Design a protein around this ligand. Structure first.
Ligand SMILES: NC(=O)C1=CN([C@@H]2O[C@H](COP(=O)(O)OP(=O)(O)OC[C@H]3O[C@@H](n4cnc5c(N)ncnc54)[C@H](OP(=O)(O)O)[C@@H]3O)[C@@H](O)[C@H]2O)C=CC1
Ligand SMILES: O=C(O)COc1cc(F)ccc1C(=S)NCc1ccc(Br)cc1F
Length: 316
C-alpha cells in the first residue's frame, strides 16, 4: 500500500504509527528508537500519558544520529481535558513541545470533547466521584487550536473521541478557520464504527483507529472480556495469509483508508506490526472482519458520563 494519506491541510500522514499509552517510561525510549530504526515515521503521544519526555529523548537521539530528518517524522500529541481554556491551550501545547524536544507538532488533537476544571489533577472529581466540568465548549477550544496553527506551533489540528454531532458542530462553527484534519477514535472488529467513519470520510476528515488490537493491557481489562488477538475466526484469516493475528488487525483499518496506531514496547512486536505492507485482505476478508462488530469499547469512563459533552450517549 501507499504509506501516507493526504490530509486536508495539504500534508501527508503515515498510515501506520506507534502508540505510546501505557508504554512505561523506562521502556518507551527504546521502543521509539527501535520503531524509528525499523521504519516507523509516526508516533502517537499525549501529555496525559505521562511519558512524553522519554518519547522525546528517543526522537531527539534519532534526529541527532541522522537516522531520520524532522520533515520525515509525523509527531502527534493531544490537549488534555484540564486545558480547555483559552488561556491554557498554548502553554499545554508548549509543555508537550518542550517534553518531546520539538519546535512543532505535525498534528495536535483535542483529546476528548469534554473540558474539566483546570488544576494539577487530570481527573478532578467532586466528593461523589463525578468529574468536575469546565464551562468552556468545543467551539471556543477549537478557536484556541486554530491559533496554534497561526503561531507555527502545530502544522495540523484535529479531534479525538468526537461523535457525529460533535464533528458536525465543529464543521458548522461560525467563522471556522481550519477544518479538523483528523478524528482519532477507537476502531477494531468488535467496534467497527461504520457510521461515524462514513460521516467523517464524507467530510474529508481522516480517521485514525486507536486500540486496534483491543488494548489487552488496558488497566480495567476483565477475564471474561472479548479478545481480538485470541478470536479463532481472526486467527484463521491470519493463518490463511501466513501472517499473525496482530498483522491482520493492523492491515484491516489500513484497507478502510484509516490510519492505525498499534502500541507495543516489545521490540519484536514493534517490528512485526510494521510488516503489513506486503499482503492484502480480500473484500470477503474485510466484510467478514466487519461482521464481528459488537459495539464493544476499550475506552469509556463512568466518572465522566454526566459531563454534558461526554461523547458516547449518541449512537455515533
Ligand atoms: N485518543 C484516545 O483517546 C486514545 C488513543 N489511543 C492511542 O492508541 C494507541 C493504541 O491503543 P492501545 O489502547 O494502547 O492498545 P492496542 O490495541 O494498540 O494494544 C496494545 C497491546 O497489544 C500488545 N501487542 C502489540 N503488538 C502485539 C503483537 N504483535 N502481538 C501481541 N500483542 C501485541 C501490547 O503489548 P506490549 O506493549 O507488551 O508488546 C499491548 O499490551 C495507544 O497507545 C495510544 O497511542 C488509545 C486509546 C485512546
Ligand atoms: O484517553 C486515552 O487516550 C487513553 O486512556 C487514558 C489514558 C490516560 F493516560 C489516563 C486516562 C485514560 C482514560 S481512563 N481514558 C478514557 C477516558 C478519558 C476521558 C473521557 Br472524557 C472519557 C474516557 F473514556
Amino acid at each position: 500500500m501507499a504509506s501516507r494519506i493526504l490530509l486536508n491541510n495539504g500534508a501527508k500522514m503515515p498510515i501506520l504509527g506507534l502508540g505510546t499509552w501505557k508504554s512505561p517510561p523506562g521502556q518507551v525510549t527504546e521502543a521509539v528508537k527501535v520503531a524509528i530504526d525499523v521504519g516507523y515515521r509516526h508516533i502517537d503521544c499525549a501529555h496525559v500519558y505521562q511519558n512524553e519526555n522519554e518519547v522525546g529523548v528517543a526522537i531527539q537521539e534519532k534526529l541527532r544520529e541522522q537516522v531520520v530528518k524532522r520533515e520525515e517524522l509525523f509527531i502527534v500529541s493531544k490537549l488534555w481535558c484540564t486545558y480547555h481554556e483559552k488561556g491554557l491551550v498554548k502553554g499545554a501545547c508548549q509543555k508537550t513541545l518542550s517534553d518531546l524536544k520539538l519546535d512543532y507538532l505535525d498534528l495536535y488533537l483535542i483529546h476528548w470533547p469534554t473540558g474539566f476544571k483546570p488544576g494539577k489533577e487530570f481527573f478532578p472529581l467532586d466528593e461523589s466521584g463525578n468529574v468536575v466540568p469546565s464551562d468552556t465548549n468545543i467551539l471556543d477550544t477549537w478557536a484556541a487550536m486554530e491559533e496554534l496553527v497561526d503561531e507555527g506551533l502545530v502544522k495540523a489540528i484535529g479531534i479525538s473521541n468526537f461523535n457525529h454531532l460533535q464533528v458536525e458542530m465543529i464543521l458548522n462553527k461560525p467563522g471556522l478557520k481550519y477544518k479538523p484534519a483528523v478524528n482519532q477514535i477507537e476502531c477494531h472488529p468488535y467496534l467497527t464504527q461504520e457510521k461515524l467513519i462514513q460521516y467523517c470520510q464524507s467530510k474529508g476528515i481522516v480517521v485514525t483507529a486507536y486500540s486496534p488490537l483491543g488494548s489487552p493491557d488496558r488497566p480495567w481489562a476483565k477475564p471474561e472480556d472479548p479478545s481480538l488477538l485470541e478470536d479463532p475466526r481472526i486467527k484463521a484469516i491470519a493463518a490463511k495469509h501466513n501472517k499473525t493475528t496482530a498483522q491482520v488487525l493492523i492491515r484491516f483499518p489500513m484497507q478502510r483508508n484509516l490510519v492505525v496506531i498499534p502500541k507495543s514496547v516489545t521490540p519484536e512486536r514493534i517490528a512485526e506490526n510494521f510488516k503489513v505492507f506486503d499482503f492484502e485482505l480480500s473484500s470477503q476478508d474485510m466484510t467478514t472482519l466487519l461482521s464481528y462488530n459488537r459495539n464493544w469499547r476499550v475506552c469509556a469512563l463512568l466518572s465522566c458520563t454526566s459531563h454534558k459533552d461526554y461523547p458516547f450517549h449518541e449512537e455515533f
